Amino acid sequence: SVEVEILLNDAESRKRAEHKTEDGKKEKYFLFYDGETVSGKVSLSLKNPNKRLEHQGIKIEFIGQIELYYDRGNHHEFVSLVKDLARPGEITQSQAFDFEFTHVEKPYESYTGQNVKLRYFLRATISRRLNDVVKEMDIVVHTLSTYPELNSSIKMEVGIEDCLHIEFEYNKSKYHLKDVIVGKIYFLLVRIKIKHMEIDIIKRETTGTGPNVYHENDTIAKYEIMDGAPVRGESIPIRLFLAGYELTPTMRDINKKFSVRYYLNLVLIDEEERRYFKQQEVVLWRKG
């Protein structure tokens, strides 16, 4: 009876970002940053141009909220702005209503995770006696940072006295999202017979919900290094292209509800099928 659209000013020109939604599917959403004005109009179209629409008011909201999958009915809005667009009355005619929210606070980057989602959206509501007409439209927020940062390489060792000394050296402890992890694996001592080696990027998601803490992992990338036994004096250059990976910045204690942290995990498997692991955190940040 009423089709409601949310149309942003300069929709057709404004930046859109790809985002992996809850069912694994990728879509584009309008992209915003902290502080940016959110502007547009709410358009009502009447299915029958002759009939009047009785309502108890028309509203648009901008909302940022955290949705905890273990407590999914409980909304944890951290920013909510409300602009009433019409007092109760009557709509006899298809029309649009302008809106502008200025200085819009968006302190956290959008995130769709395993046990949590952090999302922003615009919600247009026509209040009715019977059933309200509600239309939402998601928007995506990114958070930029800047870091120093100078040439201080990091070392990751697997060391078994008298048996194994394998060293992975890489260029930074922090990387932006399209950066390259530049490193080298050195085989200093190889008395154990190794049959496979790889380096993985692991995302670890930590969520609090009620009195409980949930942990989930996701292997983002597997860089297969070598099959068969390495010998001492060999050296393998490593370049991991982060731009080919689906990545968010590191997120720590987001409104004390969740964390997203990233690790390099060096994996060796010997001829006896024994796993040897070693991990170090890398801080991922978004460069503007």
Side-chain angles (χ1 to χ4, degrees):
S1 205
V2 218
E3 172 209 284
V4 181
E5 297 297 328
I6 296 166
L7 314 160
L8 291 180
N9 289 338
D10 267 277
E12 75 274 11
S13 78
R14 143 154 259 120
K15 38 268 103 155
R16 290 167 77 76
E18 203 127 293
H19 198 68
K20 225 190 207 292
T21 63
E22 259 190 284
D23 61 0
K25 253 77 171 217
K26 309 165 88 159
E27 261 132 38
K28 277 167 254 183
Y29 306 87
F30 293 115
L31 179 53
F32 288 78
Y33 303 85
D34 195 10
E36 282 205 77
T37 292
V38 175
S39 264
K41 48 171 101 281
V42 178
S43 302
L44 272 50
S45 296
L46 283 53
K47 180 185 173 179
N48 181 41
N50 288 205
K51 267 197 172 195
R52 319 103 100 272
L53 184 74
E54 300 288 338
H55 68 260
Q56 282 92 65
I58 304 164
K59 248 207 279 243
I60 177 98
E61 302 169 279
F62 185 86
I63 298 192
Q65 73 187 23
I66 299 175
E67 308 173 4
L68 295 167
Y69 297 5
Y70 279 94
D71 189 15
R72 188 88 200 233
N74 188 348
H75 301 118
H76 295 290
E77 298 99 351
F78 50 86
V79 53
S80 298
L81 319 168
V82 186
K83 192 66 62 168
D84 301 323
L85 307 170
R87 64 181 196 166
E90 200 191 36
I91 274 153
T92 65
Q93 186 175 17
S94 288
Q95 54 184 292
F97 296 93
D98 277 353
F99 70 88
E100 181 187 53
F101 294 109
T102 70
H103 295 285
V104 181
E105 198 188 82
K106 308 182 209 69
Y108 313 119
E109 164 149 338
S110 288
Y111 179 70
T112 303
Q114 328 186 55
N115 291 140
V116 224
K117 183 187 304 183
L118 182 159
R119 77 183 261 256
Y120 298 82
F121 60 97
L122 282 160
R123 183 167 62 212
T125 301
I126 301 169
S127 305
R128 303 190 92 191
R129 283 265 40 250
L130 273 147
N131 307 250
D132 292 350
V133 184
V134 182
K135 144 107 317 170
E136 297 183 0
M137 178 186 78
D138 267 57
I139 67 106
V140 164
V141 171
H142 292 168
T143 301
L144 317 171
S145 339
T146 61
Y147 280 91
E149 18 71 52
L150 280 214
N151 333 292
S152 103
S153 90
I154 316 299
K155 291 198 273 264
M156 176 174 335
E157 324 258 340
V158 167
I160 302 181
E161 184 168 7
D162 294 311
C163 278
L164 201 55
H165 191 183
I166 289 173
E167 177 181 318
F168 173 52
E169 187 163 23
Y170 59 101
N171 65 313
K172 337 186 190 164
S173 64
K174 313 191 159 24
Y175 290 96
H176 63 91
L177 304 177
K178 298 177 139 314
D179 218 339
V180 182
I181 306 196
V182 180
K184 195 157 221 190
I185 315 281
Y186 304 87
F187 312 109
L188 304 155
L189 177 57
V190 188
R191 298 192 181 121
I192 285 156
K193 283 306 194 311
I194 296 304
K195 79 181 221 89
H196 180 62
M197 301 180 280
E198 76 184 60
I199 299 153
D200 310 331
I201 296 162
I202 315 283
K203 181 173 66 83
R204 306 192 188 281
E205 182 200 281
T206 307
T207 301
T209 312
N212 308 116
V213 182
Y214 299 95
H215 296 89
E216 295 290 328
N217 310 293
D218 175 354
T219 297
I220 287 323
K222 304 180 189 223
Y223 189 96
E224 320 283 1
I225 294 157
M226 182 181 258
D227 299 298
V231 294
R232 159 172 138 79
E234 294 175 340
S235 226
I236 298 167
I238 300 298
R239 290 185 82 95
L240 311 183
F241 300 90
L242 303 181
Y245 289 119
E246 261 147 340
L247 296 162
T248 84
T250 295
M251 287 163 196
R252 293 295 298 285
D253 308 312
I254 307 299
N255 229 183
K256 301 316 176 193
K257 296 212 189 296
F258 76 98
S259 294
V260 183
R261 296 168 82 179
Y262 293 91
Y263 302 77
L264 296 168
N265 201 62
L266 175 67
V267 174
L268 330 172
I269 310 188
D270 70 24
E271 284 176 31
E272 291 63 43
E273 290 300 315
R274 293 185 292 236
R275 274 62 184 166
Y276 303 72
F277 305 147
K278 188 44 143 261
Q279 85 168 358
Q280 273 164 355
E281 184 182 8
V282 290
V283 174
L284 303 191
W285 56 280
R286 194 184 282 282
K287 182 180 173 173

